[PDB]
Amino acid sequence: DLASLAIYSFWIFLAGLIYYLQTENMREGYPLENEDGTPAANQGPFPLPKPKTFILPHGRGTLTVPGPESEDRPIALARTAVSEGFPHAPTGDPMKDGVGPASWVARRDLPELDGHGHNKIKPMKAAAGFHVSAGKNPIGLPVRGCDLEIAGKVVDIWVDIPEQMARFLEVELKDGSTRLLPMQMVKVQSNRVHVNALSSDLFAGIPTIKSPTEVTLLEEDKICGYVAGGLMYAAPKRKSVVAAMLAEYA
Amino acid sequence: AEYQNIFSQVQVRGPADLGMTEDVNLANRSGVGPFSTLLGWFGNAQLGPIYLGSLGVLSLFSGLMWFFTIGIWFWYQAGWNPAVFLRDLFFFSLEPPAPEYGLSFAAPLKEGGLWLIASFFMFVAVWSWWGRTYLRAQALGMGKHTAWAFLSAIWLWMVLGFIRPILMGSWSEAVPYGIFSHLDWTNNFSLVHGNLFYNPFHGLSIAFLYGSALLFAMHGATILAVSRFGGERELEQIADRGTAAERAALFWRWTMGFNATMEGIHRWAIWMAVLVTLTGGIGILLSGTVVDNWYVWGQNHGMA
Amino acid sequence: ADKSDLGYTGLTDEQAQELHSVYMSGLWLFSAVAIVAHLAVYIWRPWF
Amino acid sequence: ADKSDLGYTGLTDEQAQELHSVYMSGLWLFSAVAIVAHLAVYIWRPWF
Amino acid sequence: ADKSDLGYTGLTDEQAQELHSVYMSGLWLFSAVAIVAHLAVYIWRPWF
Amino acid sequence: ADKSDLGYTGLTDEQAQELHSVYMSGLWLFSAVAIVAHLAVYIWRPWF
Amino acid sequence: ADKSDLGYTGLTDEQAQELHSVYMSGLWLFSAVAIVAHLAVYIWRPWF
Amino acid sequence: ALLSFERKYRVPGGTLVGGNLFDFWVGPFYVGFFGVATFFFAALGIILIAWSAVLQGTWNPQLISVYPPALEYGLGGAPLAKGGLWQIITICATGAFVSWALREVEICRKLGIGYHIPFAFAFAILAYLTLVLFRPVMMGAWGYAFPYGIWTHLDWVSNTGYTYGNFHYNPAHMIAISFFFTNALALALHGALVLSAANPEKGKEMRTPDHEDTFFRDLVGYSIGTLGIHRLGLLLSLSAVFFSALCMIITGTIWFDQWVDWWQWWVKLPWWANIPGGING
Amino acid sequence: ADKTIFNDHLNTNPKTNLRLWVAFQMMKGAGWAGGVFFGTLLLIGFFRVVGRMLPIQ
Amino acid sequence: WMIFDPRRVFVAQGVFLFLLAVMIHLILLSTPSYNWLEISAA
Amino acid sequence: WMIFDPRRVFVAQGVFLFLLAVMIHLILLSTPSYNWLEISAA
Amino acid sequence: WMIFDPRRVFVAQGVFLFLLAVMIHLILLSTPSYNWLEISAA
Amino acid sequence: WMIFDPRRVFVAQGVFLFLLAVMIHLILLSTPSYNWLEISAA
Amino acid sequence: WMIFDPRRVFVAQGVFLFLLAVMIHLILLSTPSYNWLEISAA
Amino acid sequence: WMIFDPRRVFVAQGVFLFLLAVMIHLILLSTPSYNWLEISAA
Ligand code: BCL
Ligand code: BCL
Numbered sequence A: 001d002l003a004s005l006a007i008y009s010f011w012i013f014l015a016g017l018i019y020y021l022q023t024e025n026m027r028e029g030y031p032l033e034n035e036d037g038t039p040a041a042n043q044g045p046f047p048l049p050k051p052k053t054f055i056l057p058h059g060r061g062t063l064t065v066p067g068p069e070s071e072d073r074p075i076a077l078a079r080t081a082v083s084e085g086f087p088h089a090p091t092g093d094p095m096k097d098g099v100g101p102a103s104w105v106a107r108r109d110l111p112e113l114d115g116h117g118h119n120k121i122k123p124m125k126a127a128a129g130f131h132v133s134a135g136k137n138p139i140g141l142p143v144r145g146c147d148l149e150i151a152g153k154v155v156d157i158w159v160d161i162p163e164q165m166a167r168f169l170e171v172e173l174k175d176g177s178t179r180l181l182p183m184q185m186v187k188v189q190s191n192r193v194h195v196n197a198l199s200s201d202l203f204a205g206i207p208t209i210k211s212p213t214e215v216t217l218l219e220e221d222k223i224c225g226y227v228a229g230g231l232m233y234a235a236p237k238r239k240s241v242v243a244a245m246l247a248e249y250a
Numbered sequence B: 001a002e003y004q005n006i007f008s009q010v011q012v013r014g015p016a017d018l019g020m021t022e023d024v025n026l027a028n029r030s031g032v033g034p035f036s037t038l039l040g041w042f043g044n045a046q047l048g049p050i051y052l053g054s055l056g057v058l059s060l061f062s063g064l065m066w067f068f069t070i071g072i073w074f075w076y077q078a079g080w081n082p083a084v085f086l087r088d089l090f091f092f093s094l095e096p097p098a099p100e101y102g103l104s105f106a107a108p109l110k111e112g113g114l115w116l117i118a119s120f121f122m123f124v125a126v127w128s129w130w131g132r133t134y135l136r137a138q139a140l141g142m143g144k145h146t147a148w149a150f151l152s153a154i155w156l157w158m159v160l161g162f163i164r165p166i167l168m169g170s171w172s173e174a175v176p177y178g179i180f181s182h183l184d185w186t187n188n189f190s191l192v193h194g195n196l197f198y199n200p201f202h203g204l205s206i207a208f209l210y211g212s213a214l215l216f217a218m219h220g221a222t223i224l225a226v227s228r229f230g231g232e233r234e235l236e237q238i239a240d241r242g243t244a245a246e247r248a249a250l251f252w253r254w255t256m257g258f259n260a261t262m263e264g265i266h267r268w269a270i271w272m273a274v275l276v277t278l279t280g281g282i283g284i285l286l287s288g289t290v291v292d293n294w295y296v297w298g299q300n301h302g303m304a
Numbered sequence C, D, E, F, G: 001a002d003k004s005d006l007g008y009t010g011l012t013d014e015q016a017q018e019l020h021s022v023y024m025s026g027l028w029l030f031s032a033v034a035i036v037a038h039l040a041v042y043i044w045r046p047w048f
Numbered sequence H: 001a002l003l004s005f006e007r008k009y010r011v012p013g014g015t016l017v018g019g020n021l022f023d024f025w026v027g028p029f030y031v032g033f034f035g036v037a038t039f040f041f042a043a044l045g046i047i048l049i050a051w052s053a054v055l056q057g058t059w060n061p062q063l064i065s066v067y068p069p070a071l072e073y074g075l076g077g078a079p080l081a082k083g084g085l086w087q088i089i090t091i092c093a094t095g096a097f098v099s100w101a102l103r104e105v106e107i108c109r110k111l112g113i114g115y116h117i118p119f120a121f122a123f124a125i126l127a128y129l130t131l132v133l134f135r136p137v138m139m140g141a142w143g144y145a146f147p148y149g150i151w152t153h154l155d156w157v158s159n160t161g162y163t164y165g166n167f168h169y170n171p172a173h174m175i176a177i178s179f180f181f182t183n184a185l186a187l188a189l190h191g192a193l194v195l196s197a198a199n200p201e202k203g204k205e206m207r208t209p210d211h212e213d214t215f216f217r218d219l220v221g222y223s224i225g226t227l228g229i230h231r232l233g234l235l236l237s238l239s240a241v242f243f244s245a246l247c248m249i250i251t252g253t254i255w256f257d258q259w260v261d262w263w264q265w266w267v268k269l270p271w272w273a274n275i276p277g278g279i280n281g
Numbered sequence I: 001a002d003k004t005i006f007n008d009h010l011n012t013n014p015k016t017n018l019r020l021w022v023a024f025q026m027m028k029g030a031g032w033a034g035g036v037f038f039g040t041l042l043l044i045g046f047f048r049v050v051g052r053m054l055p056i057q
Numbered sequence J, K, L, M, N, O: 001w002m003i004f005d006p007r008r009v010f011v012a013q014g015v016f017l018f019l020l021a022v023m024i025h026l027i028l029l030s031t032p033s034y035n036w037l038e039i040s041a042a
């Protein structure tokens, strides 16, 4: 048709594009809030749109995103500097309130639903998935903490169907009160598991699941998030933990 | 035989779970393929089922017969022995009617032979398989975005042997057939049009292919990094922002200087895919009847 | 200690004995004194 | 603790408190000098 | 643990011991050092 | 353990026991090693 | 065939007793039919 | 600057030795212990494109040229603009890339995500550095490299890019495009994937993780999971870098001749050695 | 054995440094080695060491 | 929401008109007619 | 008030002038007709 | 301690004099017409 | 719902008067018959 | 630990010597110095 | 121990020689120095 023609519909329309896209990327999180709960200093060169249609996956009603941004979940920090930019500091222990590394938020009590008529996640004792018949079978195995010390025995699996991949290692204590712990943070070398995230004297800090079967969405934030709690902090400052944090490969 | 429980990765197998039933069919889905548990403790291990009929036994069969059309022009030169066939499994070659016959299908089986048949069986091997990334995208009630990166993908296929070399009066302007043949054409459209560098359409067609290792070099790293929280389930993180959507919405803001959402990261991933072969769709749709040279196009618009 | 709503911070007088006492170090020595820096400029060398 | 529905702010009367200082008069002398420092240029040098 | 008002930290009385000894005399350990250091730079070598 | 004043830290007089041996004598013998080198470098052989 | 007895691995303390053990003792009878053929090739055929 | 849920994540540390000495948030941008270093490297290298401008003859980004050192000066340096200024931008840019890939680790120890992100820019330091530290280092000097520009190395990738004949002939390269065409094969789908969940046709329920085994199994027949496409999307884009370094670790230092002279060791076989056949015959 | 603070010790003769350190912490270093410090210096370190006595003509 | 106040006019709106300056300046200072900076000597 | 006096006041004037002077040295090195030993060459 | 002793000036100033000396080496060891160690044969 | 106004006229339609203003202004300046403003030289 | 033996050391004793033997013999199976195997021909 | 018996002594003992021997009998069929069976005329 022409030598210089189609490009002047490319630097104009397709340049009206990173202005149409970056907003569809700056929805969740925005609008901007400061460090207490207050209309912020700005929003950006790509201002945020008012949310559109999001029909919910399991008839859960009406929620519009960008959605919850305000201060509903509990926050507590002891300020060391007042001007915006410098970090904050926990009041008590940083493993107590949940400020800094271990991150979560208050969600509504409903287990992730998929399809057939039951929750997304269940163990092997309930959802009789795959059993044990012939040969020697490694279900019921000892574990080691980040302090290089025995913690508990994992004796059951949490199975899956659509994605065929187990998710949790239910650590039952001697008390019988079960403690929960995610999947992409564990490494077993030989016969006994060795953890490097949480010591064997900090496992009750992660509270228990009130239902041994229900996997609600309020409770999938700390169980897989507290592992970060001892990834930032643990453990200052001298001695045997320095030979357990630095170096290494995997 | 039993099924092992290796030391924490982990896995438990899936039994007889097909999927959903609303608009698809399931009777043609005859048998769930035998599960190759290839120590499937990393990804998955599931085969079947799938959609069967004639919206399907046409792409395979036209793929086949297109696939069959170029391969016997590899056995044609061999000497009728299977030794030369794998020795030149690539050195053999095949093209359409001569640059002085072109549009004419009247080329015999001797010379400009087996290009009119493969492109005839290809033309029902990808225009009824784009009618299955667009139709099975409704087999339940979903969108069609899957065939909106496939309608700008068979668009670089809508110049190379369709729209250029048919209203240009030449089949030799359509691509040779096989493994080695078409590479004396990826270095033939290059000596000819004056080096396609100063051609910022093929050139900025490349500027949407060097960026799909700038969006996927980090996507398979970062969603493998937020996984220790629970953002691998990409259908409970968008509206119901998960705890892997607060281990990611700060990172790239702090780093390079802009974050996305869990609906947001799939909107730059396919705005660096629907424009790969589109700017090069326009970047082989303008390398023809405009200015034949791009060295004699790169001295008229580019410094002026 | 935690904070509340608009407009901490803010707010006073950590905005009046602080932010008022740090900001005007860029709206005078670069606003009015730059016109004294204009002195050796506003004729060297625009006029030929 | 934070805020409520659209908009807040808002709000009456909080709209004309933080959106009428460097936006109403902040873009008024910017327009004044856009006629003041333009009329001395209306004549030089569109004319030779 | 944190205090109340203006300002911290800090730190009365450290308006004339912390924010004037390594802050205003910094405009002396480099600004006044420039007075004697520049007396052999402005002529090397704008005047060749 | 930290103190109060300036520098503290400091840490008076850890401001004159560690800012002396490697701060002064480190940079004074970085001035007794750098100046001297020039005296075989200034003229060999920028002049050619 | 490996190194020692039930079980391995193994072992505590380990490493100071494994990879130090797979480069001498298993080479103690390899280098028992090796060094002989090295002294036979200290003269044929290096110097042609 | 911070998001609405960025009230809590604000915690110091992360950096290596010394303290929170460098770790201050400036804007949305993270300025950590590798922060005023990348402010140091950035405000030092943009003028390293403007240095070779008063000399070469081109201030314009069109044809700014800081050429690689001459092919034959040795293990030392070069002239000025033709290798010297080239050798100045050498530890300014490569000084910045890892003032940033271990400053990402100043955001990975700070929280507790997977250490897999400061790992994918690392292949960007395994195809670029297959051009400075690898090939130029041995066969003589830094002369076996390219000018820095946006265009100069283009007509360097073209004209001086047929020196191994026809490069499609190269088998390390071929298969460092065969991971560069499937690069975008598993993204044109994966990208449409999680838009059609929330927004189907109009007003229809959102989808769930079981409508992925009735669509892609309803597609090509394979379904390695929902996190099995962030582990076959990193099998797409990182590997177009070190099988391309492969035909830049074997190409010019071992086989500086044609690599179309490579596909004639497939016919030299006692079976079909003295007996030609197809095409060749 | 304890100050209740951290997880290790001060001095003493027994109880400590008898089977810590050279046991548990960084034991993966040598297992990772044997193929990285051995398989990447049979043509690089030996590459510039023969250039010594023979190249003296 | 949508657009706030005290952050744009300090570092962003300061490079919104300066950006709009050099997209006007870099056009009218090179035409074979005007100039008014170089054309003042010869 | 605020900021840092025992921290970021002896380190905000050590990599700040070096990030405004010594990086600025490179542009007056971008001369080779001036230059403080290139005068022999031109 | 005003600044850090066993942290900022036992090896970090060792890469301060080192960050200056060698970036200019490839300006003085370089140059198209100085050398006096390369040009001795031709 | 589904779309916006306080974001499509305060910052969108207000840039729709600058996006469309200058584009053809230089399309009718590239075509040499108007010019229209260059009264200086002549 | 961290290094395997039931799998990864049975390859370090069984065939590590066979490799470091015959693979180095490949090059000097036809060499213009040592020979000792192709010296004989007549 | 540390390796399976009925997979590296019985029938997998036949792939440590069957692969070792036949590949040693495929290098010297293109070489006319040995052969030992190709010449049967005289
Ligand atoms: C516009 C310029 C040319 C052209 C430029 C290039 C260049 C440059 C390249 C190719 C390459 C390829 N091209 Mg092409 N190609 C064109 C456009 C096309 C179109 C189309 C119009 O839709 C198709 C179907 C193809 C087909 C192909 C593939 C056979 C091959 C690898 C692509 C890839 O990365 O997928 C990989 C993933 C898939 C799922 C595709 C499946 C094909 C298999 C997996 C790859 C084939 C490898 C080899 C030939 C097989 C040998 C097997 C033997 C028995 C040992 N090309 C046009 C005609 N194309 C690459 C190549 O290596 O060529 C041989 C290459 O570098
Ligand atoms: C001198 C060399 C020139 C040059 C010479 C050429 C020539 C000639 C060509 C290109 C083209 C292109 N160049 Mg170039 N190019 C240069 C520099 C580069 C560089 C670089 C060094 O940075 C790269 C990475 C590239 C690569 C590219 C691409 C951006 C572009 C073609 C897109 C494509 O192949 O998708 C194609 C993908 C599709 C069409 C999708 C497939 C759709 C079909 C219909 C579906 C069939 C699928 C089939 C069923 C699969 C079967 C699966 C089986 C079941 C296994 N060029 C230099 C400057 N380049 C090509 C182009 O089109 O220009 C824009 C082209 O012809």
Ligand code: BCL
Binding pocket: B186, H097, H123, H124, H125, H127, H128, H129, H130, H157, H161, H162, H166, H167, H168, H169, H173, H176, H177, H180, H181, H240, H241, H243, H244, H245, H247, H248
């Ligand atoms: C005869 C012509 C040859 C050919 C000529 C060449 C030449 C010449 C080269 C290649 C190279 C490559 N070719 Mg080829 N190539 C051919 C045609 C093709 C086609 C095609 C479709 O036809 C394709 C898809 C390719 C693709 C490929 C890749 C396999 C390989 C480049 C790897 C890479 O980019 O990562 C590597 C990534 C990097 C180097 C980037 C490093 C990352 C850095 C750290 C980040 C930069 C940051 C930046 C400075 C800052 C900017 C950001 C702003 C601040 C915002 N070639 C034909 C067969 N090709 C290159 C190669 O193999 O060498 C490695 C190469 O030199």
Ligand SMILES: CC[C@H]1c2cc3[nH]c4c(c3C)C(=O)[C@H](C(=O)OC)c4c3nc(cc4[nH]c(cc(n2)[C@@H]1C)c(C(C)=O)c4C)[C@@H](C)[C@@H]3CCC(=O)OC/C=C(\C)CCC[C@H](C)CCC[C@H](C)CCCC(C)C
Binding pocket: B210, B211, B213, B214, B217, B218, B256, H038, H039, H041, H042, H043, H044, H045, H046, H089, H092, H093, H096, H097, H098, H100, H101, H117, H119, H120, H121, H122, H123, H124, H148, H149, H150, H237, H238, H239, H240, H241
């Ligand atoms: C196989 C690896 C693939 C890859 C991965 C990858 N790239 C990445 C990342 C990852 C994971 C990031 O995390 C980081 C990022 O921010 O995300 C986009 C990045 C990045 N990839 C970028 C670019 C890039 N990556 C490329 C390629 C690739 N990236 C590969 C395909 C390419 C091409 C096309 O080759 C480019 C141009 C940057 C946007 C960003 C790197 C951010 C960064 O590290 O900034 C540091 C730089 C400075 C502080 C500036 C100082 C440098 C000097 C001042 C000047 C430099 C001189 C030099 C010559 C520049 C010239 C540039 C061009 C003219 C060549």
Ligand SMILES: CC[C@H]1c2cc3[nH]c4c(c3C)C(=O)[C@H](C(=O)OC)c4c3nc(cc4[nH]c(cc(n2)[C@@H]1C)c(C(C)=O)c4C)[C@@H](C)[C@@H]3CCC(=O)OC/C=C(\C)CCC[C@H](C)CCC[C@H](C)CCCC(C)C
Binding pocket: B059, B060, B061, B063, B064, B067, B125, B126, B129, B130, B133, B146, B147, B148, B149, B150, B151, B152, B153, B273, B274, B275, B276, B277, H181, H182, H183, H184, H185, H188, H189, H219, H220
């Ligand atoms: C945005 C550009 C990117 C892109 C996008 C893209 N590619 C796409 C799509 C999209 C949206 C699809 O929707 C479609 C797809 O379904 O992906 C899996 C596809 C696709 N892209 C593919 C490849 C591909 N991607 C490419 C690249 C790219 N595609 C870019 C990176 C290229 C290039 C570079 O040219 C190619 C060649 C395929 C994987 C798939 C095309 C699916 C298709 O059309 O196949 C139809 C099915 C057949 C032809 C079956 C016949 C099989 C053989 C032909 C017969 C021989 C075998 C047979 C089994 C004989 C045995 C006998 C038996 C009966 C026993």
Ligand SMILES: [Fe+2]
Binding pocket: B219, B223, H190, H229, H230, H233
């Ligand atoms: Fe993804």
